[PDB]
Each structure stands twice: as structure tokens, then as C-alpha cells.
């Protein structure tokens, strides 16, 4: 097997570790033994933080970072340096892997270290180009960073490399029992010249990673599983953190009757290391269709067969130890409480060591094909049709990576973009590349890692907008109102009463009665997402044809231009003409953007491209601002529905009766029923409805409310914005990415 | 069939036709027939435009141009206007242009209509967001454009659009056997909103067309036979004009063993009418596999038998009139010139109607699977590999479109990117949509229409720059020089001689001797062409190899950077520390982008996706200017190399020595051979030769001579650039552009 002499010399140069803080090492603390999982061995001493190491680190990462923020071009310099020394200390970083997590050494040294040091230096680039090309927006600050115990050099690569692009500083925290190769990452910075400062590891277990979220940082960048996802949802809701969360969600690996068999049961068994713990990959859930089901199964359990398990640091194996006797047990309770199925493993489990586990004949509507999955373990279901297969497929909670294999040209790409997550690899998986994005939707979290397409979230406008202030509704005498003005709501391509059956009166400034508005409720608010899921049509749409409606709303505002500036003074007292030229302006912005807002073609590489495409988000609610009683409606709408949403909008509630005028210009307009549903009342009622509801993906709160929404959006971890938003500002190519997701579809390429 | 009624009453209240200049139509000039093709009746009088109307046309469209120009948003209201009418107007475009130009009432309702409305409606989008998404941008001014008779309201929409869309007026000539279609599009442009003089339509012969390309307008866009393409880029040598051509080249049509047979067959019947005159099409030369061919051509002959010839209005019919007399003599000339192969024809030629028409059985090496075709009319041969079908494709002067068949996900996907072309449609043919760029590589011209992608040509940067003046040779008294300081060429990985055998002192600025620099002449450029031919796999490299050589070289000259900055100053008595690190920092500028230019995914809303890819141009030759000794040449090369192309520049004629001290970085940073290769000497022995050479791809001339250059690369019409360009200024993303081919591939997508 492989020496680990180097790796051991160096442990026991760096004796006791403290933390790696403001660019040097602090003394060891409360110390903790780190175990080699294989042997049972102790490496070293590892230190648990303390909440003065956190405010420590994070007050040097503050103090660092404005002159790492300066000047791009030296940044780059020391992105490549990194990637240089993590290539001449290539086999060093892969022995230490190995020592420290249990995983082959041939996987550490051909898969781990190569993509981390290509992380870096493709990241190099990002900041050389940043202030040309990314030339509206800044750092965001100080980043703290959490990462799993299932790949740590790779993990830390992809938080530090686009954290440190986009000129940020970092405090990360490896995954308690693997630290040893983030504290080698900690132990090369001074060589590679990074700043002092600019980088900062802080060692500990779950508590120190709350510490981390808490504490006084501009961005949280997190990857685990759900459950913590939750709670650093709840626990930075209202901050004002940016946030991005890599959850769970081991992804199916769809095999089609015409799939080339041999090589779909080869990139199978080549996975079953791989798909352990949270990352992004493909092959625990395995989707056989019938005709070919048993021929599979038969030849995968023989190609399981010669996986070998045993000594990570022989590089003849392929199954390595269990990281902690605590995922063991997990994997042997997990299999433990199954009684569902045909269990097949490949030796008897002994020691740190669990073999490859198939489980097959499962229903699809079976838990186990359900549930989380530990260990080295494959589920498998059939299918008929490959209608089926989607449909089993995206029957989770997760969406993350999926696999498809079918020697067809039309199947593959006929399926690819029906499976719902953020990565699918044809005809291969767990394909990974700098360039490619990879990141969840829903329960698998939001964000993206790697490409031009994981910058965003760690930056900021170069501009700050503030949103406009809270306005109080105009209060007046009361009187009872002898003509028909009482507004309605509009849901389902219909005006409809409010479930609750109040409405109050509106007033202009000096109290006059204007007329009245509906109050929604929370069974209002169910009614429209009824209505949106009953137009999930309109996100299968061509952009010519939501081009087409947006123009024609816009033309049919126009036409009553007039008439909306006269609503908009009788409320607000102040005159109404540019306030209606903006939306109509937001409008045939949103419709130009409707069939242009492309996906990115990346080179890899690897085996062909991968497209990341742009999708839908789904389904949007929305609460709009008090101020610009059209226009921050029109601003919230007009992108959200050009980009393939259906949308929910709470109006303005102050000044109502502008959205109210507006359900006219929909209905002539067009508009395909439940693609645009409009509440009236009051945002107290609305705002947690809307961020809790299990069947929204987004909510959009701009008129306040945001610890309350993004608390409640934790339920099932839609996306959230909560601004700022101001409706006075052209805000159009910002919300097309509120109102997108990224799909990267690797395919074959010549 | 259909009723002509309402466009003969518009053709007896138009009368004999004048021109549609400023805004009004002129009196009718000097008067010739149009005729009816399928009837031989006179349809209307029209002009031959005199001189004094092109000058007035460009008057007016110069004079209309500012304000045009002023507000997108406008703009983007006229377009959409415009689309309105064509769709309002359908079919009364849709009768003319079958009594105009033959082609089947069908097809012009079905397939041109449409497309020319989705034109407008597309690009008016591009109008309103030229201002913020295109921000560096600014319109040209006056367009002169010239279409040909295949598609004439089609080929209008695709000139007039995006010159609309980005500020620009124009003048547009329709060929002289079709203008009626422009005509009406003319008579609707006062409805629209188009400002007087925005559109400029004038109707005559090639002579017309001449003078407008030669008239005082800011670009030339042109689509028509390669020959006439030839001589425009002759007529426009040297004056500043942005020149874009769509010239000949019908595509090769490739069918695999495992192709949908009859959904092949299927597409190229329905092909055959279409694939006339110079348009982006494919199926007029057939390829099929030999394990199929038989069976393929004995389907193949059947279908063309159910192709109906006759009244282009009557709905049923697939193959109307021919154009003209002249193309029918064409066509026939044509067929009794060949006599190779096996002819055979559907029925016997009548009046105006030729037979659709296979000839099969022919060899790869014959000369008519590469000579032009005319008139309904298909060329077949086989291949025994995908490799010789490649090779068979790419065995002509052209590049165009190109369709390949095969069910088999990887091999429709790897032979795609193989074929020398700019469009490439896996399991169809003509698939054409607004979003997706189309145009020439080689002998079928250059630029691209369509996308985002077709506006950079309708476009100029908002901030012009301006070459530095040429610097002439500094002179001295002529002693000899007693060490040895003679420099040498750097060719194909080594120095090398001249050929020529001379070399010039060099002096400094008060006469010091500094060294001796070769003279190279014609036999070292083609040494340096057949190097690079030699290299041709750096242009199948991975972005990130290149990357990692671009490093290298910006390492290796910060090893040597007050060398470097001593020799500027040695040459040119000024300080050269700043341009040594604007050098470098160019080459890090080239290495972060070599993996990043990403092609852009198209939604289109026919089947599935259009991937607009980048592709290297080629081999470039490059003249540099005289100042800026080092940076000039490396802020050309740098990019260059980045996107894969292979590069032979010569340096700085006055201040050589920089160049020759580079030789030795490209050999310490491992450049494998022939992708760099470096001239030295006197420009007026360069830059005809260059420009000429069959074998260059592009010639870029930064030190004058762009008369010459840009008439002699007519030869092959290489693409050209000829400034301005300030080495000063960090051009890089613009030089991204001139060293990349835009190749459109349409794939399925679910």
C-alpha cells in the first residue's frame, strides 16, 4: 500500500493544533482526539473552538478583507498559487484524505485532490475578471462556512475558491471528525501568499459551526444535511445574511430498455463509494424499467462482487472504511428497521468495514425509496414507461442530481428536463467540473457551486437600494358609499369574493372615500395556489408565446394609462403619469426578456458540455410594497411570469385599488387562468401563510415581514428574497435570477 | 386556389412603382415589367433606380438616423408594430410573394410569413434592451443591404430587424426578379410608426445593388452568390465599413446506418423545393451510409414521385414555378453538363416547372457532390465510417449549414462539432427561428444573423478608440557589430533563419547599435502556415490545457519583467515597466477566459434547443503595430491562442527586439509548436501575402495596409480585421469575438 511517512511527519511537526486565525496558528485548546477510522488510531489532538476563537476569527476575516477586496488580479495570483501547491503536495493532501476520512486512497488521489486543485485554478480566473466583466457587483464581506465529513479537501475547495474570487474573506469550519486536510489547506496559505486574514479554520464540532452562523458575517454558505439546513434557515432569518444550502438528496439513476447495459451497471458500481453523505450524485436509487430489470440486477450483483474492501491506503481498493462508528450504526439501523425487498451484500460487514448493499424488488411506492439513505447501499425499483420513471423519480422531497441512460437520441433529451433537480448527467454520473453549476431545489436547498453561475451569491450590487418605507393607510369619516366600489380579488382567471367576506374602506389624503377593498385570508390564499397549480401549462410554454401576453399587457395598460395616473393621484395625492410610463416600460422590458434570457454552454474537461440550462421556478408569492401601487406590483410580476411562473401578488396595502383596476387589463389581456392571482388586505394576515405553504417554491416579501418569512420559508426550504426592492429602480435582470433556477444537463459532445 | 384578388388591387392602386425614400414613394423612373413566373403575365411596372435615388436614399437615412437612434424603446414599439402588420397582412404577403417569385402558396403562408412576423416580434425586444444589457454598444448609422430572389420577405426581415433594432436606418435593394414583397413591406412601414427615412427601399439590377455598396453608409450586408460576395469586399477594401456576407453553399446531408429512415427521407422531400439560391439549408448533397444507401434512395425516389408540380396558388402544390427563364436555362445547363452518376427526375420539364430531381451513384471525389447547384435538384454518394462521411462533408470551399441523422445519442453529437459549418441540425434540416444565429464560415462569407449573437454586427463600441500612429525605424551610423545580437524567426517550436537571408540593424534612439532583426519574406510565412497545420490539435484542446500554457507564459515573463522593460527602453527611450505589466496581466486576462467563453442554449419554439457554441476561427495571421512593442503583439496572440486558434504574427517593424527576446518565454512555458509562430520585418512584404494566403483563416492587419489587406482577402474570404486598435486599452473580450465561429447546433429537448 501506499507510505503515509510524509502525512505522519507532518502530523507530528504540527503537534497539538490550534486554529489557523489572522494568518497564524493559535495555541492548542481543548483538545480532541482525530481517529483514523481503519485503524482505530489517533492522528493527532484537535482543538473544539471557543465562542472567543469564532468572534476572533470572524474579526480577523472583517479586518482582512477590504484590502483583499481591492485589487482582483492579486487575488487570482494567490488562487493560482493554491491550486500550484495543492498539485506539488498532490499525493501528500491524498494520503492524508485517506487517513482522515477512511475513502480509497486511488479515489483521494485520482478524484479529490485533482478537482480541488482545478477548483482553484479555475477560480483564479473568475477574479482576474471580475471587475471588467462582473463590473455591477462587489464583495459581499466575510463568508462563514460549514462543510460534511464525506469529502474535505473537495468541500473546502468549492466554499474557499468562488468565496475568495469574488474577494470576500472566510471563517470555515471542516466537519468535526475529518479536519486534517482543511488544517493542511490552513498550513500551505503563507506559502501561496494568501493575506493575513484572508483565510481562517476554526476546528469544533455542531456548535461551533452555530457559532459560525450567528456570528457577525455577511454570508452563510452551507453543505449537510437538511435538518441543520432548517435550522440555519431559522436561526439567519432577518439578518440580512446571504445564504446558500447543499442539503441531502441521493439522486435516482434512471436505465432505460435500450440503455448501454454494461456501462450503466459499470458507472453504478463505480458510484456505490461515492454516494455517501450529502453531495451531489446519482446511483443510490436505482429506476430499472422491466424489460431489462433482471438482466440488470443479475449482472450488477456479480459487478459488486469485485468491488474490493479493505486497507485504504492500498490502491487496489474500492471500498474503504466507514468514516465513525456512528455511521455505521447508522447504516446497520437503517437496514436493520427494512423489511421491504431482496438484501444482497457482498461480504459479511466486519469491523470499520460495511460492503456494497442492494436492495432490490422495492415498490415505487415504497418508504425506503423514500428515505434517507446511509452507507454503501443501493435501493431499486422498476418502471414500465418512461412517463413512469419521472414520475417515480421526482417523487421526493429532494432534487438535486438524477442519472439517465438510454442509447436513444430523442429519450435521453426527452427526459432529462421532466426530472426535477439541478443536475443531470446522460449516460454517466457524478460528473463534476469547475465551469458546471451543481446545487439543489426543493428540499435539497438553493444556490449554486462552480461557473459563472455560482458568483452571484458571493456578491452584492456595487449599488445599494433601500427599500421605500411602510405607508399608512388614509383614514376618513366613515360614511356608507351608495354606488358599487368595493373591489374583489382575482384568482383563476376570475374575480372572486374574499373567503372571509371583509373588505374595508380606502381613502384618498384629505379622506375621501375612494371605495373598497377585499381582505384575503389564508383559504384565499390556498384558492390561488389551487389556481396556480391547476396552470402548471404555463411553465411548459414556449418564450415567444409569454413574450406575446406581456406585450399585450402592456399595450392594454396603455390604453387606460390615463385612467391608472388618476387612480394612482386619488390615493396617493401626488401625480400618477411616470409611475404608469414605468410599469408600462417593466412590462415590454419583461416581454423582451421572455425568449432571451439563455442558458450557458460550458466546455469541460470531461466527456462533452454541460448545458446549464435556465428553468422556472415554479410557483411565487409575492407581497408588494406600499408605495408604487402599480409599478411594484407591475416590477414583481412582469419578470416572474416572462420567465415561466406562476405568481401570487398580496397588492399594496395602502393603496389597493390600482392592482384592483389591473384584473381588467389581465382578463383582456389574456392571461391563461391561475398565471397571475391578485390579494388585497393586509400583510400581517398573508405574510406567514404565504412563506410557510408547502406547495409555494419562492416567496417574495417585499413590504417587511422578513424574519418572519424566512423563518417560516425553512418548512420546505423555498427560496426567499426580502429585498431590498425599490420599484423606482429598473430591478428587471436582478429578479429574472429570483425567478429562475439552474439545470445543468450534461451531454455528449464530439 | 387561392384568390390573388386583394394583391392585385393592391398591386393597380400602387401603379407603376418608384422608390420608398424619406419616408414618401417618388415618381416612377425608367420602367421594367415584373413578372409572374408561373404565368408569364406583367404584375406591375418598377424602377431601375438611378444614382441620384441611392443618394438620396443614404441622404435620407443619414439625416433620420440620429433620432432613430436616440430612444430604444421607440424603437422596440415600431418593431413590434411592424410584426402586427406582417401578421395582419399574412396573407396578402403570403399570395404576393408566390405571384412574385413561384414558390408554393404553402410555403410562403406557412413557413416565410410566419417567420419574417417572429423576426420583428423577436428582435423588437433587442431595441428595448440595447440600452442596459448592451451598454459599451452604439448603432453604426446607415445600412446598406442587398438580398437575393429565393426568400424575399424572409431575407428582408433578416436584414432589416436587427439593423432597426439597434438604432440604425437603412437602405435595402430587393433582387431585381422579386421586389414586390419589399414593396408592400415598404407601403406598410408609414402605418408602423417608422419614421420618415428610417426605411429606405429602391428597386434595380446588380448595378443598383453596386451603388449602394459603394455609396457613404457605414456597413454593407449582402447575401447572395460567393462571386458578387468577392467582389463587395473588393469594393468596400479600405473603407471603414463593417462588411457582412451570407453567401453559397448548400448544406451535405448525412444519414447514418441507424437514422429514422423515413423521417430522413421524409425531410429531405419536403427540403427540396426549399433548397434554392443561397440560403442556409441542407439535403441538396446527400451522404449515405453504404449498409443503407439502396434502400434509402429506392424510398427516396418514391417520395419525390408524391411531390405535386404545378399552380404555385393552389394549396396542394409542393414544387412551383421556377423563379426565372435564367434559372431554368441555369438548371438545365446544369444537368446536361453532367455526366456522372444516374439521373433521375420525376416528370418531364414543362414551361416554368423543372421536376425535382436525384443524381445518384456518384463519387466521393466527384466534381458535382462540389460545384454549385441549381433548381430543385439532389447529389448523392456513400460513405463506409462516420470518419469518411466528415471527410466527404468538409471536401468543399463552403461551410454553411449541414444535417446529420442517427438515432444513437453519441454519434449524432460527435459527428456534429466535426463538420466544417456554422449551423448543424441533429435529426432535421431548415430549422430556422430569430433566436438562433446563422451565417458563413469559409467561402460561404462571414458574421451571423439571428440572436444576440447577430447584433454585435448591426454595432460599434460607444467609446471609439484609435491606432497609434506608425513610428518610424530609428537609424544609425552602421558599424559592425562584433558580438552576436542577430535575431532570428520563431517557427513551428524553433528559431529558424530567414529564408531570404537578411537581417536590419537596429538602433536606438540616439543610434546606439543595439542588435540585428531578420527580414522575412513570403517562403517564412508559408513555413509558419504549414507549422500551425501541424498544430492543428491545439484547436481540439481543453479550455483548461490552454489555460494552464497561458499561465505559464505570464509566469515566465514576470521571471523576466526588468529584462524586458530594459529592452523597450533600449528601443524606445521611454520607461517600459508599465507596458511589461500590462503585458502580463494580458496573458492572465487570456488564461482566465480560456475556459469561460461559454456558448449560449437557445429556447426556440420549434423542437428542442438551439446550443449557439463557440469554435476557434483557425489559423490567424496577425500584423502588429509599431508602438508597443511587447504588449501590442501579446495582447493579440494572448487571446488568440486562449480560444484554440493557431496564430503567426509578425512584430513591431520598427521596435522588433521585445518579439525576439519573447522567443525564449514561449519555449520555457512549453507552447507546443506551431501554435505561436513569430515574423519579423517589413510589413509591405507581409501583408499582401498574408492576406492572400489560401490557408489563413483570418488576417488581422493593426499597422495599416487595410486596402490591401482587405481586398486580397477576398481570395478565400478569410475573415479580416483591420482596427482600429490601441494596445494602450484592454480589447480582450472584443478580440474573444474576432477569434471565435459561431456553430449552431439544434438538438432535441424534451
Not at 30 to 37: E, K, R, S, Y
Not at 55 to 74: E, H, N
Not at 139 to 162: D, R
Not at 340 to 350: F, I, K, L, R, S
Request: a negative charge; charged letters at 20%.
Amino acid at each position: 500500500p501506499e507510505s503515509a511517512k510524509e502525512a505522519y511527519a507532518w502530523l507530528a511537526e504540527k503537534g497539538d493544533f490550534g486554529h489557523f486565525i489572522g494568518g497564524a496558528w493559535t495555541a492548542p485548546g481543548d483538545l480532541f482526539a482525530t481517529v483514523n477510522p481503519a485503524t482505530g488510531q489517533t492522528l493527532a489532538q484537535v482543538s473544539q473552538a471557543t465562542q472567543a476563537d469564532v468572534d476572533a476569527a470572524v474579526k480577523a476575516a472583517r479586518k482582512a478583507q477590504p484590502a483583499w477586496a481591492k485589487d482582483g488580479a492579486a487575488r487570482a495570483r494567490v488562487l493560482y498559487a493554491l491550486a500550484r501547491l495543492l498539485q506539488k503536495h498532490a499525493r501528500l493532501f491524498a494520503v492524508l484524505e485517506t487517513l482522515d476520512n477512511g475513502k480509497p486512497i486511488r479515489e483521494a488521489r485520482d478524484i479529490d485532490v485533482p478537482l480541488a486543485q482545478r477548483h482553484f485554478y479555475h477560480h483564479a480566473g473568475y477574479a482576474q475578471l471580475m471587475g471588467t466583466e462582473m463590473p455591477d457587483r462587489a464583495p459581499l464581506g466575510v463568508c462563514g462556512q460549514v462543510i460534511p465529513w464525506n469529502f474535505p479537501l473537495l468541500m473546502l475547495a468549492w466554499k474557499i475558491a468562488p468565496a475568495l474570487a469574488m474577494g470576500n474573506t472566510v471563517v470555515l469550519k471542516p466537519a468535526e471528525w475529518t479536519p486534517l486536510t482543511a488544517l493542511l489547506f490552513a498550513d500551505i496559505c503563507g506559502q501561496a501568499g494568501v493575506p493575513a486574514g484572508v483565510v481562517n479554520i476554526v476546528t469544533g464540532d455542531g456548535a461551533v459551526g452555530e457559532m459560525i452562523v450567528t456570528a457577525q458575517v455577511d454570508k452563510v454558505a452551507f453543505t449537510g444535511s437538511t435538518a441543520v439546513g432548517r435550522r440555519i434557515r431559522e436561526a439567519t432569518a432577518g439578518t440580512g445574511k446571504a445564504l446558500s444550502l447543499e442539503l441531502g438528496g441521493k439522486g435516482p439513476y434512471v436505465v432505460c430498455d435500450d440503455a448501454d447495459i454494461d456501462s450503466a451497471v459499470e458507472g453504478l458500481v463505480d458510484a456505490i463509494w461515492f454516494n455517501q453523505g450529502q453531495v451531489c450524485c446519482a446511483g443510490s436509487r436505482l429506476l430499472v424499467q422491466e424489460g431489462i430489470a433482471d438482466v440488470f440486477h443479475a449482472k450488477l450483483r456479480a459487478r459488486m462482487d469485485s468491488l474490493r474492501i479493505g486497507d485504504p491506503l492500498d490502491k487496489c481498493i474500492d471500498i474503504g472504511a466507514m468514516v465513525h462508528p456512528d455511521q455505521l450504526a447508522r447504516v446497520r439501523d437503517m437496514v436493520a428497521a427494512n423489511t421491504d425487498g431482496e438484501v444482497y451484500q457482498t461480504a459479511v460487514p466486519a469491523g470499520c468495514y460495511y460492503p456494497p448493499t442492494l436492495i432490490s424488488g422495492l415498490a415505487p411506492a415504497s418508504p425506503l425509496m423514500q428515505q434517507e439513505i446511509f452507507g454503501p447501499v443501493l435501493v431499486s425499483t422498476t418502471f414500465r414507461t418512461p412517463a413512469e420513471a419521472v414520475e417515480i423519480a421526482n417523487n421526493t422531497a429532494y432534487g438535486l442530481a438524477a442519472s439517465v441512460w438510454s442509447e436513444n437520441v430523442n429519450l435521453a433529451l426527452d427526459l432529462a428536463p421532466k426530472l426535477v433537480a439541478g443536475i443531470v448527467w446522460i449516460n454517466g454520473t457524478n460528473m463534476m467540473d469547475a465551469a458546471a453549476p451543481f446545487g439543489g431545489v426543493r428540499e435539497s436547498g438553493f444556490g449554486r457551486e462552480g461557473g459563472w453561475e455560482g458568483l452571484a451569491g458571493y456578491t452584492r450590487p456595487a449599488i445599494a437600494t433601500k427599500s421605500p418605507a411602510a405607508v399608512a393607510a388614509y383614514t376618513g369619516d366613515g360614511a356608507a358609499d351608495g354606488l358599487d366600489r368595493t373591489a374583489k380579488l382575482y384568482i383563476g382567471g376570475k374575480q372572486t369574493r374574499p373567503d372571509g367576506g371583509y373588505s374595508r374602506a380606502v381613502y384618498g389624503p384629505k379622506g375621501k372615500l375612494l371605495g373598497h377593498a377585499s381582505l384575503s385570508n389564508r383559504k384565499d390564499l390556498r384558492n390561488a395556489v389551487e389556481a396556480m397549480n391547476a396552470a402548471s401549462g404555463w411553465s411548459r410554454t414556449t418564450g415567444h408565446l409569454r413574450a406575446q401576453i406581456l406585450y399585450f399587457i402592456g399595450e392594454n395598460l396603455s390604453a387606460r394609462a390615463d385612467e391608472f395616473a388618476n387612480r394612482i393621484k386619488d390615493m396617493t395625492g401626488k401625480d400618477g403619469k411616470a409611475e404608469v410610463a414605468a410599469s408600462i416600460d417593466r412590462l415590454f422590458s419583461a416581454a423582451a426578456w421572455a425568449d432571451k434570457y439563455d442558458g450557458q454552454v460550458k466546455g469541460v474537461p470531461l466527456r462533452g458540455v454541460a448545458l446549464a440550462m435556465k428553468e422556472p421556478v415554479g410557483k411565487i408569492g409575492i407581497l408588494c410594497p406600499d408605495a408604487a401601487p402599480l409599478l411594484g406590483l407591475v416590477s414583481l410580476m412582469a419578470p416572474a411570469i416572462a420567465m415561466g411562473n406562476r405568481v401570487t401578488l398580496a397588492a399594496s396595502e395602502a393603496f389597493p385599488l390600482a392592482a384592483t383596476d389591473f384584473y381588467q387589463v389581465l382578463d383582456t389581456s389574456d392571461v391563461p387562468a391561475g398565471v397571475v392571482n391578485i390579494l388585497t388586505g393586509a400583510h400581517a394576515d398573508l405574510a406567514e401563510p404565504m412563506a410557510r405553504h408547502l406547495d409555494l417554491d419562492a416567496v417574495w416579501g417585499l413590504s417587511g415581514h422578513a424574519q418572519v418569512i424566512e423563518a417560516a420559508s425553512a418548512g420546505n426550504l423555498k427560496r426567499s428574497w426580502t429585498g431590498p426592492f425599490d420599484p423606482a429602480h429598473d430591478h428587471t435582470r436582478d429578479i429574472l435570477s429570483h425567478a429562475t433556477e439552474v439545470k445543468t444537463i450534461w451531454v455528449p459532445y464530439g
